[model samples]
Target: GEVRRIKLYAERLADGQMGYGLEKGRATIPGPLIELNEGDTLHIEFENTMDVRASLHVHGLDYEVSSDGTTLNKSDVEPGGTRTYTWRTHAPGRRSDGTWRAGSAGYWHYHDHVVGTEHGTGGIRKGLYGPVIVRRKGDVLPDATHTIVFNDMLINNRPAHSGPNFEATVGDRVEFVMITHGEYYHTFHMHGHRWADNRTGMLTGPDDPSQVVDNKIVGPADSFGFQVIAGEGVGAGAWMYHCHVQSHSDMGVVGLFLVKKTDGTIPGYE
Candidate 1:
């Protein structure tokens, strides 16, 4: 029913270096958000602007192995190469036969799943990711829709303010969808308010990656939903949600969330 166009570009530093460098690069897809409804067809065009080959992966959606875009199942887009990923959302919860369970409503992400490429690299780190908030056909619209994107680097790829922060007025019940695009673990803690984990599918341990705990492991390409009450007692000031990795936070991967007054104005940050 709607269309949202987006673009992906390869970034380079002024000195011709790769990985977060800022000299020059190429724009892959320059378009709007591809918005489609249930039972509608989605035609996606992806262009490779870098010298190497790359592909796109739509995480969390059900599709054939060929359409998943994993390294083993990828469509090569060489330098200045382009390709299209055509599919339909008709089988929302299951295959066309409606046998399996369909996905729930939440935030999803897209990325390049080419093998040998570093996670979040290949210009993906430079804001190449986008949100896929799906809903069933004819569902009531939310009172308000807010999008909070979690990134590894905030200021010039530096770990300066490594936390999640957003602003909201008193008495405002907000729904937050948090997504981690990096390959590290981050425990997002909000100061004065307690939120629920809507996506309690998997949890991993704090220190041991091998140890699979009940509620600790948040797998890659996963998302969590939280319902927050802003401006509650003691939560009126500035608060933060950041990765536990102190070094990464120091590099600018953190963010802030501010609780405002009923008038929708946030007090100054100390």
Candidate 2:
């Protein structure tokens, strides 16, 4: 509903990976979170600091062809180059035909589309992506938001066994944006928590028939999100979240949703 602007930098990390950061020399694997409301517009001044080509291609939003961050569109920025990408969102409404048009409200993402092989294969592998969320006018807001990106076999480009743990207090509303990348499919599973299968991951009423599930199947470029009341029925504790695939879970694709009690202590975890 309004115009906004932000600056981003694509830089190489000391770990030999690349990322999109809001500041120079501080990029992370999954980049920075881009949040917007339906009917709003955003302009990003993206700067590529690396020595190779890079661009930002987003999903689920509106943009002109010039914003298509691809070699085909010739929108990829050269090394040390800068470019502005504009994206817009709109609310759902009835058209002249009296048909409903879906609004751009959902969990979406962005990534480099011009890296290795023009598909950003090399760039994504090194971490050139981030989470984007478009909220509808009256969408319930959460007290906290976390992003979980399963890029290849790594979580947010971190090493195995080292989870990017999320923390919260009991009764707090927490939102999660889950994204997947690479060539494999994964069943994202969480313990002691659940969500509805419908948009917003919530039931509209007592009669709402949305399936409540704790696990979901996802593949490359897939994104979805949900909000949960931390330890609503389940008491505060360190709840495990990981890929349900036997081999994947065993290989250390794991993390913990650490919900703390009012006194700031987890039930049975350090």
Candidate 3:
């Protein structure tokens, strides 16, 4: 029906680099967001620069064989090569008349289905996955947007530029587009700030009613969204948002949310 075009590059970083890197748009490792509506065409152009064969794979969507991103060594996209895979990247929940129906909706992700070593060497070892959000057309956006993806027990791919440590103001209504995938059981815990319920993002009211604190579990092949009022009466400073598990929290499955005061004057954070 409709078309969306995107590119991904698979290559090594430097002379001493040990793993692969997939670049889409500007940089890789915590790649670009692949957002689409139902019944839309996906025009994907992926290049194999890792001096081996590679292909892009997607989940939670339908596809044709031509865009399967196979691991058949004979069919792999060669090194220094580029290939375009076109397929319909959509599902149900909304009909052509723009009305509601069936099917799942919310956050998701895509990765390299097959890379060198005949499996998932490129993306699994290096960090080649990114977020995907499928929503109905005209869905209202949250006051703030944050996509937190957990892979290999790490957030946003790796440390430094990954994970939350997200920024927000005291009264801003924020939304979290969350995804969890890897080899462990993870619970998304946001301390100091609580939401309305576990189902929807509504906080402190009848809209999305709930308590001050509760443990919410997120696992592999699952994605969901929740909205909340940033800080609420908690005000400014650093707050901890982690997995709640002592092991995960100690191992860096944690984040420090920075909330600055907006008491009439402008706020600044270094």
- TM per candidate comes to 0.64, 0.98, 0.75
Cα deviation at 257, candidate 2, in Å, is 0.3
Better of 2 and 3 by TM-score: 2
For residues 122-151, write the lDDT of model 2, one tens digit per residue.
888998989999999889999999999988
For model 1, give the 10-residue run with minimal summed lDDT: 26-35
Q: Any idea what lDDT model 1 has?
A: 0.49
Better of 1 and 3 by TM-score: 3
**In candidate 2, where is summed lDDT lowest over 10 consecutive residues?**
23-32
- The models' CA-based lDDT, in order, is 0.49, 0.91, 0.64
By lDDT, highest first, what's the ranking?
2, 3, 1
Error of 3 at 103 (Å): 3.6
**CA shift of 103, model 1, Å:** 3.6
Tens-digit per-residue lDDT, 120-142, candidate 3:
55455456566666655555456
Model 2: per-residue Cα lDDT at residue 161: 85
Candidate 1 C-alpha error for residue 115, in Å: 8.1
